[PDB]
Amino acid sequence: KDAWEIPRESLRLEVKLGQGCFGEVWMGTWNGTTRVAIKTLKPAQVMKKLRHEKLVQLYAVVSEEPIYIVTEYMSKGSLLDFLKGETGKYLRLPQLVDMAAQIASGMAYVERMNYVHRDLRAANILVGENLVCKVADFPIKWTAPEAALYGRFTIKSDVWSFGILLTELTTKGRVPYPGMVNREVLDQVERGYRMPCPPECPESLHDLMCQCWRKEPEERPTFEYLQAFLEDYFTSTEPQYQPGENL
Ligand SMILES: O=S(=O)(Nc1ccccn1)c1ccc(/N=C/c2c(O)[nH]c3ccc4ncsc4c23)cc1
């Protein structure tokens, strides 16, 4: 084994927080002092080589079935649930952009570490205290055409999903391509269809999404660009922003 292995006895699963397939997620205490999250799996790790403030941190692992993966605890759960919850209705464009910046900053690290996530979506972003967001869990509606058809997943197919994730943020959690089943989405997107600008969303934020959805993967911006554009959005791109009714 490796230095990531711990004894199961050192773990204390208390509350169940997630009903999942091929597993479940539990909250608990580690070494009696640390609050942790434990993901159990039912009958390799890129999470060991990756470390960043905007990626959910691995703490330890029981590699003997029952398998337990111990990670840092994110107190508000999934970004999708957070957006569709009681507070999401109060999120305005400034908090939504800042959340996008944290995800972009996590993805920039993945990018310069030369890895690919393959399933970037609000469901896989975890929220913590203080609107902290972290990427986790390293689906056609979020997958780039070349990836969903030919299995060509690169950092640039993640950039595509990042754009869809922006539509999730600016709609407060709505599903992409409303009213469309998977087959019509793939058929229309191949013919050049792109989701329009969500209501009350500035055109400059939609312009960024369209950049993420360019057919040519190399023409799509990097996460480093995306991070800087969004961190600086209200000064350099939309200095005259004014809160509207629902954003
Ligand atoms: O309050 S809740 O809304 N629901 C509930 C449900 C039951 C009791 C109380 N509350 C919530 C949901 C998830 C959550 N956190 C989960 C994770 C975490 O803390 N670290 C993780 C690392 C990986 C990972 N992969 C799938 S989940 C997950 C998590 C925290 C609170």
Query: What's the order of all strands across the beta sheet hosting 11-20?
Result: 11-20, 23-30, 34-41, 67-72, 58-62
* DSSP three-state, residue 25: strand
How do the residues of the chain divide into helix, strand and coil, expressed in percent and rounded to 5? 40, 20, 40
- Give the H or E element holding residue 100: helix 93-112
The residue type at 242: Q
- Closest atom of ligand 1 to CA, residue 16: 7
Q: Helix H segments across 124-192?
A: 145-150, 155-170, 182-190
Fold of 79-236: Transferase(Phosphotransferase); domain 1 (1.10.510)
**What residues pair up with 67 in beta bridges, in sequence order?**
41
The rounded distance, in Å, linking the Cα atoms of 193 and 84 is: 26
The rounded distance, in Å, linking the Cα atoms of 33 and 11 is: 10
Distance 201 CA to ligand 1 centre (A): 30
Q: Which two tokens stand for residue 128?
A: 């913590």
**What residues pair up with 126 in beta bridges, in sequence order?**
78, 134
Q: What is the separation, in whole angstroms, between the first and last Cα of the chain?
A: 49
> Are 87 and 129 within 8 A, CB to CB?
no
Q: What kind of experiment solved this structure? A: X-ray
The residue type at 106: G
> Are 146 and 190 within 8 A, CB to CB?
no
Please identify which of the residues 81, 98, 119, 137 carries the catalytic annotation. 119
The residue type at 54: K
Give the position of tokens 């927080």.
Answer: 17
119 touches ligand 1 (CB under 6 Å): no
The residue type at 244: G
Q: How many residues does the chain have?
A: 247
Q: Where are the domains of the chain?
A: 8-72, 79-236
> Are 162 and 226 within 8 A, CB to CB?
yes
Closest of 109, 142, 150 to residue 212, by C-alpha: 142
Distance 77 CA to ligand 1 centre (A): 4
Preceding omega of 239 cis (within 30 degrees of 0)? no
- Closest residue by Cα to atom 5, ligand 1, is 17
Preceding omega of 66 cis (within 30 degrees of 0)? yes
The rounded distance, in Å, linking the Cα atoms of 111 and 6 is: 30
> Are 142 and 148 within 8 A, CB to CB?
no
The rounded distance, in Å, linking the Cα atoms of 230 and 208 is: 10
> Which residues, including other chains, have CB under 8 Å from residue 84's CB and lie 6 or more apart?
172, 173
Which of 26, 74, 117 is the best mutation target for the ligand 1 pocket, counting ligand atoms within 8 Å of the beta carbon and taking the most?
74
Give the position of tokens 């629902």.
Answer: 246
- Closest residue by Cα to atom 6, ligand 1, is 17
CATH number, domain 8-72, options 3.30.390.50, 3.30.200.20, 3.30.70.1060, 3.40.50.2300: 3.30.200.20
216 annotated as belonging to a binding site for a ligand: no
15 touches ligand 1 (CB under 6 Å): yes
